[PDB]
Amino acid sequence: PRPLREQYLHFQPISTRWHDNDIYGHVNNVTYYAFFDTAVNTYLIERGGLDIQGGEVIGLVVSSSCDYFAPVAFPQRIEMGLRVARLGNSSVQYELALFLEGQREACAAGRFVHVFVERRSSRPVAIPQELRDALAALQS
Amino acid sequence: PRPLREQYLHFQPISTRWHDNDIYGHVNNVTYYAFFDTAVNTYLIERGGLDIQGGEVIGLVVSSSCDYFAPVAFPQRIEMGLRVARLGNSSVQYELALFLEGQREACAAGRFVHVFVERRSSRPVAIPQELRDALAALQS
Amino acid sequence: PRPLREQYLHFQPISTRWHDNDIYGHVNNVTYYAFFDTAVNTYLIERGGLDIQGGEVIGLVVSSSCDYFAPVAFPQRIEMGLRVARLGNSSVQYELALFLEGQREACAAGRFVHVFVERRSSRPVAIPQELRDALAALQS
Amino acid sequence: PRPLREQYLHFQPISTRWHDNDIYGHVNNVTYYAFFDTAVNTYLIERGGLDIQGGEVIGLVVSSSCDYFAPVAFPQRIEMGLRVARLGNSSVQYELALFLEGQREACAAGRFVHVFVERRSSRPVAIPQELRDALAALQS
């Protein structure tokens, strides 16, 4: 049961980094998470309009998780699939998968959840229209 | 329900680091995972006997996940709860929770899973006796 | 000539972390810099009064550098020497050295330079009295 | 005295990452160093032949330093200039500068030094011909 390129709507390429490999020769399992919210926020920055610097509205990570199938190593060229699952109105949930360039099978694959808040108060908010617009653009 | 200090068998203290705090003031959600397998492996190193540098046997992270309840920021003094859930014989599952010093409530809390393999072949193996001994030592 | 514990006025202990070790077994050369401004800012926070979250005044790193003498690896217990070299009035220069516990010889050793600015304008400022007080406290 | 695109021979583009920004909104000064040896080793991997996994021969960082001129922030598109200064025969010295895409002026700029060794012994060695070949290819 290993995810596939075509199950995902948006694709970020990310350059790997020397100190991505951990001591056993392969990208540390933690790094995948960094690849996630990079992948996400990049999309959010360029399309949702936020404005992190910036924004009166910001997303927060309340939970995440990831499953690892095959190893990847610097310097290889990883690239990140992205698609939205559930989606409340102060809240969302993404599905990420990392693919090696030219492979149908995901290398690992995971999910996490954003909760949008007012920056100052950290109190939940409706997803403003422009975010919601681009967010929805990734719904299955 | 937000986990509690006494539900956990082993305790690693970890110094937070300047660049732990992300752009919105608080320790990045990713860092938690770093705190996990630090917390784990540290115990593994000192009590399972491995031997990561030298070990013919090494652990791999095949999945992990985490839920976040309250924010923490450098320079505060986090400290990490640890306990084993399930436990096969080439395989294990930890349950981690991070605690601010002193608070009864976990700040976030998560789990992940080790698979022990022969370093060279990366083929699964029986948990050698010393590991299994200290691992089991954390069983509920 | 390899620096020595007694040449340094303040001492931060820092827990090493699993993914500190790079692919060749030893704490990545980059991590040292992380250890620096952790070591610094920690002292700054607790004794200069800033206040990074809240501070109208913040420090910026305009240059740094480091020389490496002996390797260190998670899980060993490094610990960080600190002292001030030069010291203008909107500007300062620290000298850091990392020590294995206990060794008289520094493992690596480096320096870097803070420039205090008004957070908003990022325009240079006089070091406010409390900072200057604790800063000077580390002058040779 | 701020470096210029045309003073450098090779150019790595590197994607920035969410947790590159530190607490004051801009890429942490430590990250530049990660950008350095990424930039380097990538070139070394694809052209010097090593083989880090791999190699009986590996490079080590004995010193580095960096000067910061202008700030950069995720998600902007940084990209790394690269050119060799000095060059012994067990030893080398690179000059790095980071450029924002479409700027003549470097954002920061730095140097560091490799020392090649036999992996196992960590004892110096002559730069094998293929490395030396591509290394030299970057001499002023």
Automatic annotation (TrEMBL), chains A, B, C, D:
Pfam family, one: 4HBT_2
Gene Ontology MF terms in the entry: fatty acyl-CoA hydrolase activity
Keyword terms: Hydrolase
Superkingdom of origin: Bacteria
Family according to the record: Belongs to the 4-hydroxybenzoyl-CoA thioesterase family.
Name this polypeptide is given: Uncharacterized protein
Organism per entry: Pseudomonas aeruginosa (strain ATCC 15692 / DSM 22644 / CIP 104116 / JCM 14847 / LMG 12228 / 1C / PRS 101 / PAO1)
Taxon lineage: Bacteria, Pseudomonadati, Pseudomonadota, Gammaproteobacteria, Pseudomonadales
